[PDB]
Amino acid sequence: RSGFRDRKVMEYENRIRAYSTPDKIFRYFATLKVIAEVFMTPEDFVRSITPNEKQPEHLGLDQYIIKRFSQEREKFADEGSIFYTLGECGLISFSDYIFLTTVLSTPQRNFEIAFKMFDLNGDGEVDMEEFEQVQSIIRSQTSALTTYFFGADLKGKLTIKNFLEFQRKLQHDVLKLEFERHDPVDGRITERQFGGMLLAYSGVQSKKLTAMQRQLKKHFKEGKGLTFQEVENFFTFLKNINDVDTALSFYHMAGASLDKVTMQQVARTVAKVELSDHVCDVVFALFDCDGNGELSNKEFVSIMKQRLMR
Amino acid sequence: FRDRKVMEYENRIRAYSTPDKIFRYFATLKVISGEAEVFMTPEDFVRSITPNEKQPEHLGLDQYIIKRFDEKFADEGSIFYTLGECGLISFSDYIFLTTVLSTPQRNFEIAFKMFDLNGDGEVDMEEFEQVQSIIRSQTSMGSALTTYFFGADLKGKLTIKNFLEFQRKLQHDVLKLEFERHDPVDGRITERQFGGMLLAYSGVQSKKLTAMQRQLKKHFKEGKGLTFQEVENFFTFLKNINDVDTALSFYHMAGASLDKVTMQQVARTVAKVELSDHVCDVVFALFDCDGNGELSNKEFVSIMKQRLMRGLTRLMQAMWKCAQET
Amino acid sequence: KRSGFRDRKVMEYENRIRAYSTPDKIFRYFATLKAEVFMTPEDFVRSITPNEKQPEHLGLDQYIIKRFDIFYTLGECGLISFSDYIFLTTVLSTPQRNFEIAFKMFDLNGDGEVDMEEFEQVQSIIRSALTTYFFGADLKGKLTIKNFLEFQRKLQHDVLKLEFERHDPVDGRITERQFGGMLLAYSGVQSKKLTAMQRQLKKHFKEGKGLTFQEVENFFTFLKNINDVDTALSFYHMAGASLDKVTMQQVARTVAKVELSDHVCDVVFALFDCDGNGELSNKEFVSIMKQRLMRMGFTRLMQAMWKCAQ
Amino acid sequence: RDRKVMEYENRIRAYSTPDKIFRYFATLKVIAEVFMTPEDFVRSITPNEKQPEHLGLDQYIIKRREKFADEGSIFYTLGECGLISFSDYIFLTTVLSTPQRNFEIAFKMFDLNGDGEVDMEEFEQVQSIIRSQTSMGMCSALTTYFFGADLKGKLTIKNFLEFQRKLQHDVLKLEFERHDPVDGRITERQFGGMLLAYSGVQSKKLTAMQRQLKKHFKEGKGLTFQEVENFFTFLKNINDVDTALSFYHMAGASLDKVTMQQVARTVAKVELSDHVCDVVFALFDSNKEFVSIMKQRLMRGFTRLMQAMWKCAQET
Amino acid sequence: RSGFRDRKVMEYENRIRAYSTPDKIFRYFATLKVISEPGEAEVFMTPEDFVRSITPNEKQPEHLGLDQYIIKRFDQEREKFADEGSIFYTLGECGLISFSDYIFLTTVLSTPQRNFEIAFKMFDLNGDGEVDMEEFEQVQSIIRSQSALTTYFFGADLKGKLTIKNFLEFQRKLQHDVLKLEFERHDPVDGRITERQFGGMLLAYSGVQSKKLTAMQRQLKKHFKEGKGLTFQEVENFFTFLKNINDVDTALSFYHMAGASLDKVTMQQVARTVAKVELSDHVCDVVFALFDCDGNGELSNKEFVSIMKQRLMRGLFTRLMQAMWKCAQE
Amino acid sequence: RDRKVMEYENRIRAYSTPDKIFRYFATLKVIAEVFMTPEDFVRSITPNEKQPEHLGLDQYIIKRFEREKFADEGSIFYTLGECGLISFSDYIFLTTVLSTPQRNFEIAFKMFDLNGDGEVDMEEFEQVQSIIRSQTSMGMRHALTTYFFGADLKGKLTIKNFLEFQRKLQHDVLKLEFERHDPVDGRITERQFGGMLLAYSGVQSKKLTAMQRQLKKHFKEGKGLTFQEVENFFTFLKNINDVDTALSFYHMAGASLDKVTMQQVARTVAKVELSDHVCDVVFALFDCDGNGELSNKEFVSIMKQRLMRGLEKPKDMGFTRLMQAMWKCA
């Protein structure tokens, strides 16, 4: 089969994603050349950070699609998408690319502080140039919209409250696109796809997704599917693994069973979010010990941390 | 060796013996009433959790100082009174007080929410016994003040707020005893004792303590002294080292010199607290590269952490159990 | 509700009495009759079994009441006075070895003759109605290590049946979980390790066929030679062999001179194999058994090493 | 020179590979296979005893029906006229240390009916196992001996334990002889050097004994070999001898020369002659301590627990 | 029900193979007792016997056994005992193996090329390694330490040198000729072997893994690779693949850390690059049914390269403990 | 006093992070970036070498950005880009090239070039390193790319060229280790070469004196070893595996492990000529006791830890040496 080609193709695509210069990555994943400069569609962007999704055949390295340069022009983004704030109509310039990749992987922690740095008294404000600095610094651990951030004149102040909102939102749209790049029939994704998602940033544990489908097959949960809401609530649960971690440990030490009920519980009390009953059966299929239903917390929290961190 | 062989020993006990073996060693009183119980004074309590402090050699392991079931032992106010006795700490009070010293706020909050399913966090009496019990299964180690917490009927509840305050004052009362064991003079502490206090939970680091009294003196900055407030404050700035750490890192990179000012500025923005202009002399004295005012932030955040964390291959603990019982 | 928290605190207390109180304090708490206070065979087995809740109404100094109408050799109709307790306990515990040496201490030129006032002294030593049975009606009779061992030996058989009846068997058979729990008895919260047994059993079709009391006593005498059963299983392993249901049988046959039913094996290997193989965990097994059979340092210095090894 | 020489040797004994130990104490070479003689054997495991300096380190003596052992010393069943090959050294050293219990359980694995019979190749596996946990582990004419000349016979624990029992004995006579018995007796002091052969300070607590056996006119009598042996036999029991002494202790009776010979007859079923006891108290006086020494002497500040660990490990 | 009797018999025989003298072994597995005039006789083993005595778990014909043989009366005109051109012919007799040749072959089938190249170099300081007759006798003694073919090696006059290049080839044949005899010893049908019999060869030298074999057929039954059979050639390649377990153990470790899955594919890959051999899809299909993890096509590499090197050699906190159990010694 | 200092260092070289280690032994700061002089690099891996008491812990010689040259012409270090200065970045790479076996790179490179011996593009090489680092005790905590993959980075690297880089590096570092002993005329001391051998070895630093006394009574004491003498000895060492078996055979063969045989083993097993003097020193401290006999076992052992630069992450006596200390306290 031509499946030994995919294997070598992803290995390659992956190697780029994690060792090549920002530049090269871009010239690989981005599929649009506009007359003349290259841009990557939201889909491309996301596919550049997800490490296993293949690149469209004849597109690829230094091979893009030629597109001839009002409210009647092409639109790749969508209603609300933070990708419009990027000037174009949902297209991401190489420049926008760096910014965005570094606003995706850095913690609120860092920004909150780095901002407070330029507002010794206020809670955190930055002008057009101050911000340019907060990046050079933050980028050391990894005018499209400049006007969007500081009025049209560039004398506007950027607030940590607004930025966090900006990030907390970029993350939403990115997370949705990942749910989208799986073809959801009626808004639902497979119990297998959902796992593919939860394990993306991990080894070839892609084989334990079979250990899952069996577990579900047995208990008659073999095929409902996971809607985005369900997927998303899990991921807002995941932003707290730290608290969820130390919280799942106490339930352990207190001699309770780390089963579906206590996970749903640690979600309400530690992350103030209601988990779907199915998400838990699926987050268990592939995370309990072996059939146990005993959420192997150590192993869980681990994976989730790199998933949560891309 | 006359003192080091002694200390280096006591320091091993604190660090590896059973809570018990530690309590019998450091505790100084044994109150009689045909039955008797061993009580450690607040003084002993602090000495049992702060290394490099010799116990009265005459007292020591199982050697106490008999009293007659009455006479107060702790300062005027100290949370050590809520303990029922008059400043005394029974083996219970001890195991409890120490576990309420090492576990961070975070953990109690999360632990308390494990009961007030629909609210900030309210734990009744039997739910509390169940929170410590759980919390203790992590601490280095692992009737009088229960009324103080749940009324005299025991039917009241505790709040994660009031308990965090209880813990805040326990940490304060301790900080003051650790400050007292240094013989203040008009409320001042040696530039060397405060230094000592910092390197306290480290090792033979006590040689860089003399490399400090030399540098601190070439600059004529040894003699002004340090008040408990000056000190208490530095320690409130310590409670946020994680944010301090990752705050200095940006300043450093962003270019700025990590000098006496930057520290004080970071202490304000990131830790909402003022750092004594002289406290910084002592900190930089023994934490800056060398002559320069440039502080060695990486090493600073290192020590400061283990200082903030008195105690929290832990086979060595299990090989000890088997090195004596064999 | 907290009906369990209050229960687990009840047990914990009862277990601290049983493990710290004077023989006096003990007997009073469990003894359920009243004159002089006695404890039937049910009371006795319970006063030496941890995690067995005493009928609350009764408990401390609260016993039923009745008028004067091998637990029979004691005197009464199966009821055990207090002296008999302080005796039968010291007997049920101290091993053969000790009595032989205490007896061969008064019969230098034999195996161990012991008259009445010599038995008294033997008891006293060890510790730190039926006597008319042991030494004739004139008390000038003598007791042999042979008869005495036969005494203890039978007592041990009757106190062992007592636990087998303390599970209400259906047609002589007792539950797989009932037998397996009977073992773990003297240990920790390992009571949740049985749930993992019922699983290992349910998989290979063998979850309730039944365990004849005979199978239970044929497995206990097997647990008598542990010290050799251990040194033997260890010679097997080292000899490249495999510690499996086959061999465990062999050993029980040769070294203990007894037969182990394949079933009892499966229940044992169920909750003692290396988490699902067949490879008995000899070291771990012999440990629990020795503590089970009993009712110090470098014992944990080992498990600590293996954890860190991972 | 001595205090330094001996130490060196003791070390070899205690830390060198069997090969390097053998080649040291071994003194011969026949034609070329280096053999060691009973003398040499006992001298290898007896600490504080020096080797003929001219010989020693890879230094032997060349030879080419000259007997080297007593009339019926087990060292005859080895094939030679009393010599011990390298193989016979390894075999014997593990038969000396390893306890009966260990040999019985092994033999009993290969014997469902009886108590412990073993064909040739089985004896080889049980010996592979046994030796793979002896301090020494960390062909011979014997096998024609144990299993007929056809190699089809079976060994009994009775018959093996009996062999091992005789070996122990026959080495004791070699130890007790390597002292110089006059008329067949050994100095009060000599039998003391044996009891304390496995401890540091000898001549310290020794001369204190001589002082005490003088104060009580109990010296110069000399100890026979039967006496000395009857003692060590008593020694191969300290485990029960302990739980025995303690019992007499609590029972009220004082632990004296009498209640001891009393324990002897019941725990090891042997008669300790009076003089043997006078000598023991002479330098012991405290059951708790006493046992300890007789422990390290019976066996022969903890880098040994690391070894207990390799063992547990080898058995899990 | 009585497959038990079958095991004690099976064990007894390995114990003879592992802990007996070469003689007692020869006297047990050997099956021919050739007699001649007037009253002198000798015992020989056929190649089928020789191979059986080294391959554990194969039962010896009940009625034959210890000292029990087939009596043959002394005979290019007489009967042969081995395929056309089986080294066993270079031995002199017609495939028969004398007690002496038994001691030989055993010490040669085992030991590594390395050891032989080094021992030869000792006698040809300037050269690659030549050996006359007496020296070769020495090498054998050196290796072993813890009449018709001698001519075949050193000319008809014993005045001949033997080269490593050559001798090693002899070794190479011996090894190969034995492998065929082991394969053949599983009654092939149309030169192909059962799936179970292949596992048989692979687990041959391991303990009592004989129940995993059953676990295997099941694994195989699900994915319909139930009974296609294995050619000898398919086998011999997996076996020369094994002659590299080292470069393969470290190769699989890297593929592991490098992210990649240890599937039926990467093994093929590993064999290609590392051992310059091509593994057959079916061979891998059997290997995984015997070594996949829970049964998810994930090679348990660790325990695999472990069981295989034992098979490669025909060997008849564990180490993390072994280390310090001596480290405290140094 | 001087002891308490050294201990610290080793203890840092042993447990500290690849950064704490770097900021300690590196001696420059260019304006701003920290660097280490080849002298520093070597100094950081060789245990017991003292760091200029005025530098160390975060201290450096501030330097200002045919300029200041820091290494004997030709040195590989120059390929690092700068004038011979090793940057932390390149510090790790270099320590992970020195410690690991040639075998590994060979295998590792095969994964990315099925056809040939092995090639590796710029990013594929990033993977090899990454993986290979998981091994080393350095990277188990923690410029030239252009030299490697052309200027455009679109080039390829060979195993050959690379192994050539590794080869040339192991050398230049051995030269620097040599020079950092204060050679006169180009000769180290009988005692300093012995030092070199037992460098990454235990605290056996009280046997050099037993060695100087031995060389003494034999008029060995006082001639010195050249660098070539030492080099060939280390090249000899690049095969202690075959030399271990080679010595072991000569032994059983019956030959004595003397200065003459260890000279013949150097030739046939490594195609290198050992000099009498290097032999005299090796034997001076590695002979059994008195006879010229080599204690080959103990010899190979030590030489191995030395051949490993002590950079081979072995948790063997790890938790042991430490937990042993506990003992010597209770």
Curated annotation (Swiss-Prot), chain C:
Expression sites by tissue: Expressed in epithelial cell lines. Strongly expressed in epidermal keratinocytes and dermal endothelial cells.
Post-translational modification: Phosphorylation at Ser-21 by AKT1 impairs its maturation and stability. Asymmetric dimethylation at Arg-300 by PRMT1 decreases the calcium sensitivity of MICU1 by promoting interaction with UCP2.
Effect of residue 118 to A/K: Abolishes mitochondrial Ca(2+) uptake
Subcellular location: Mitochondrion intermembrane space; Mitochondrion inner membrane
Recorded consequence of changing residue 5 to A: Slightly decreased ability to inhibit MCU channel activity in absence of calcium
Main localization, broad class: mitochondrion
Entry GO MF terms: calcium channel inhibitor activity; calcium channel regulator activity; calcium ion binding; calcium ion sensor activity; identical protein binding; protein heterodimerization activity
Region K/R-ring, annotated ranges: 25-28
Chain sites annotated for binding Ca(2+) 2: 273, 275, 277, 279, 284
PTM annotation (Phosphoserine): residues: 21
Consequence of substituting residue 46 to K: Does not affect interaction with MCU
Region (C-helix region): 300-310
Binding site for Ca(2+) 1: 107, 109, 111, 113, 118
Biological process according to GO: calcium import into the mitochondrion; calcium ion import; cellular response to calcium ion; cellular response to calcium ion starvation; defense response; mitochondrial calcium ion homeostasis; mitochondrial calcium ion transmembrane transport; positive regulation of cristae formation
Residue segments, region Polybasic region: 1-9
Disorder cited: Myopathy with extrapyramidal signs: An autosomal recessive disorder characterized by early-onset proximal muscle weakness with a static course and moderately to grossly elevated serum creatine kinase levels accompanied by learning difficulties. Most patients develop subtle extrapyramidal motor signs that progress to a debilitating disorder of involuntary movement with variable features, including chorea, tremor, dystonic posturing and orofacial dyskinesia. Additional variable features include ataxia, microcephaly, ophthalmoplegia, ptosis, optic atrophy and axonal peripheral neuropathy.
Curated annotation (Swiss-Prot), chain D:
Phosphoserine carried by residues: 16
Subunit record text: Heterodimer; disulfide-linked; heterodimerizes with MICU2 or MICU3. Homodimer; disulfide-linked. Component of the uniplex complex, composed of MCU, EMRE/SMDT1, MICU1 and MICU2 (or MICU3) in a 4:4:1:1 stoichiometry. The composition of calcium sensors within the uniplex complex can differ depending on tissues: a MICU1 homodimer can be present instead of the MICU1-MICU2 heterodimer in skeletal-muscle and kidney. MICU1 is recruited to the uniplex complex by EMRE/SMDT1, and it associates with MCU at low calcium levels, occluding the pore of the MCU channel. Associates with the MICOS complex.
Residues at which Ca(2+) 2 binds: 285, 289
Outcome following mutation: residue 20 to A: Abolished ability to inhibit MCU channel activity in absence of calcium
Protein name in UniProt: Calcium uptake protein 1, mitochondrial
UniProt modified residues of type Asymmetric dimethylarginine: 304
Native source organism of the sequence: Homo sapiens (Human)
Consequence of changing residue 289 to A: Abolishes mitochondrial Ca(2+) uptake
Expressed in which tissues: Expressed in epithelial cell lines. Strongly expressed in epidermal keratinocytes and dermal endothelial cells.
Keywords: Allergen, Calcium, Calcium transport, Disease variant, Disulfide bond, Ion transport, Membrane, Metal-binding, Methylation, Mitochondrion, Mitochondrion inner membrane, Phosphoprotein, Repeat, Transit peptide, Transport
Family: Belongs to the MICU1 family. MICU1 subfamily.
Segments for region (C-helix region): 304-314
Residues of the full protein shown: 107 to 467 of 476
Function per UniProt: Calcium sensor of the mitochondrial calcium uniporter (MCU) channel, which senses calcium level via its EF-hand domains. MICU1 and MICU2 (or MICU3) form a disulfide-linked heterodimer that stimulates and inhibits MCU activity, depending on the concentration of calcium. At low calcium levels, MICU1 occludes the pore of the MCU channel, preventing mitochondrial calcium uptake.
Mutation effect (residue 43 to K): Does not affect interaction with MCU
Stretches the record annotates as K/R-ring: 20-23
Swiss-Prot record, chain F:
Effect of residue 329 to A: Abolishes interchain disulfide bond and heterodimer formation with MICU2
Record keywords, A-Z: Allergen, Calcium, Calcium transport, Disease variant, Disulfide bond, Ion transport, Membrane, Metal-binding, Methylation, Mitochondrion, Mitochondrion inner membrane, Phosphoprotein, Repeat, Transit peptide, Transport
First-listed, main subcellular location of the protein, grouped into a coarse class: mitochondrion
Consequence the record notes for mutating residue 329 to R: Increased degradation by YME1L1
Result after altering residue 264 to A: Does not affect interaction with MICU2 in absence or presence of calcium
Expression by tissue: Expressed in epithelial cell lines. Strongly expressed in epidermal keratinocytes and dermal endothelial cells.
Modified residues (Asymmetric dimethylarginine): 321
Effect of residue 11 to A: Slightly decreased ability to inhibit MCU channel activity in absence of calcium
GO biological process, one term: protein homooligomerization
UniProt effect for mutating residue 8 to A: Decreased ability to inhibit MCU channel activity in absence of calcium
Example GO molecular function: calcium ion binding
Residue ranges of every copy of the EF-hand domain listed in the record: 100-135, 274-309
Description of how activity is regulated: Activated by spermine, kaempferol and SB202190, which bind MICU1 and prevent MCU pore occlusion in absence of calcium.
Consequence recorded when altering residue 43 to Q: Impaired interaction with MCU
Region (C-helix region): 321-330
Binding-site residues for Ca(2+) 2, renumbered to this chain: 287, 289, 291, 293, 298
Residues where Phosphoserine is found: 16
Top-level lineage group: Eukaryota
Subcellular location: Mitochondrion intermembrane space; Mitochondrion inner membrane
Post-translational modification: Phosphorylation at Ser-16 by AKT1 impairs its maturation and stability.
Record note on what altering residue 13 to E does: Impaired interaction with MCU
Domain notes: The EF-hand domains have high affinity for calcium and act as sensors of calcium levels. The polybasic region mediates interaction with EMRE/SMDT1 and association with the uniplex complex.
Name the UniProt record assigns to this protein: Calcium uptake protein 1, mitochondrial
